[PDB]
């Protein structure tokens, strides 16, 4: 077979009527994953950092 005859990708290729269709979806997903991760990391860090603050039993009002 001739290498110049590219195999069929029709089943995978999107009928390009909206050029930035896959891009907008991918970037939204990537962006949302980045958002929820950053909030998660912040919460995780604060959880550990706050474990070092004065314990409930040592806040005695003399």
């Amino acid at each position: 077979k001739s290498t110049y005859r590219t195999p069929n990708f029709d089943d995978v290729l999107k009928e390009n009527n909206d050029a930035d269709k896959g891009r907008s979806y991918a970037y939204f997903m990537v962006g949302a994953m980045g958002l929820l991760s950053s909030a998660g990391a912040k919460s995780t860090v604060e959880t550990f950092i706050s474990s070092m603050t004065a314990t409930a039993d040592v806040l005695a009002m003399a």
Binding site: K1, S2, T3, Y4, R5, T6, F9, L13, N16
Partner: protein, 431 residues
Amino acid sequence: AEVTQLSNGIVVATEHNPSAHTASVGVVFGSGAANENPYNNGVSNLWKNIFLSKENSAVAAKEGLALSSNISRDFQSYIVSSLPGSTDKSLDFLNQSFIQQKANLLSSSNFEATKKSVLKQVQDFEDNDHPNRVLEHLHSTAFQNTPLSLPTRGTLESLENLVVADLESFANNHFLNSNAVVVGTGNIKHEDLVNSIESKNLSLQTGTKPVLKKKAAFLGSEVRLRDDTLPKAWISLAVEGEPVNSPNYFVAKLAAQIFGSYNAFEPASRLQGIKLLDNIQEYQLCDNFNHFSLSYKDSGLWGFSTATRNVTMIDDLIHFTLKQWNRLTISVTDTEVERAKSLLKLQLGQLYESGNPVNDANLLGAEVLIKGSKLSLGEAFKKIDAITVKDVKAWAGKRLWDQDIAIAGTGQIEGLLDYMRIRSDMSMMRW
């Protein structure tokens, strides 16, 4: 520097130049490999070869005429060169081969001898011309299932299954009057040629128009022709470029001049004012590279091609090259642009004004077929000098920044990383 073009029944285009010594005459049709099908692919190249066949060529040699033909994507041309005095005898041979002998050239003994020659011709190309082979496959994948994907020389399988009838069918559908332009370059006058043409009447298939098709489109993709037996790796990479008659036609060509071409063995080449050279010369990432801005009727390709024996560092070659291209959107300098302008003029000049009329014919013909006229060399320079850093940035931010690419390569390309890795380098991280 005169661009004269008038229309009677046929459109005549000429560009006279006093001192020339010779004159070239020929017809250029507005159809090429981009008009063929995957199955009759190579018919145009086949036509070119019989037009230059020993028989037809000997008839012109006796008369003291030289033949030349060129098969491209958007067009096709048949040229006859002669002395300034025999400017009329070239037209006799032109008409005699496109009306009288448009049945004598297609003999069963001539066709088979020619077919056998283009087969060994196209085979030799695929077997040894790796850089052009790669560039051809680049068009193939970049424009797959679209007109620009078909290779100019045609494929071996479509060629060997081609018959005399296919030639005729193509000739009767594209070698029409409304899809043609008679070009004359050398020293002969416009009025000198148009008279000899308007002298002999006869329309021959007038009013007939060529068949239509579907618009060309760029598809980010790749074709990897790995071959570990080859001593090097040849790669070509590009983004969707600019079509001819595009506002950014020149901005694109200037952008390619910024990175230019290189040859590691030429002392002077290693000294060019190209920032990319600081990166690639340390470990000698390649033997050579060259950027280009290919333009066609419906689309184009902007990118580069390269050859290398440093098979374990191909990723650095691609990485440094793409980082430089990133600069066009964010930090290209005034002096880089200015250096490009000067060098673009020098190269554009050396092309448009060579001491060979056959090149002039192809350049003139191809232009008038698309825009109905030719932009003067002096007009180009005005457009080139008018380009600012802001223009290049706006162009790059639209054509290069975070845009799909097309890749093709052959030889020892194990080190050429996956698509996504290359594609990710079309941009940079930022706050």
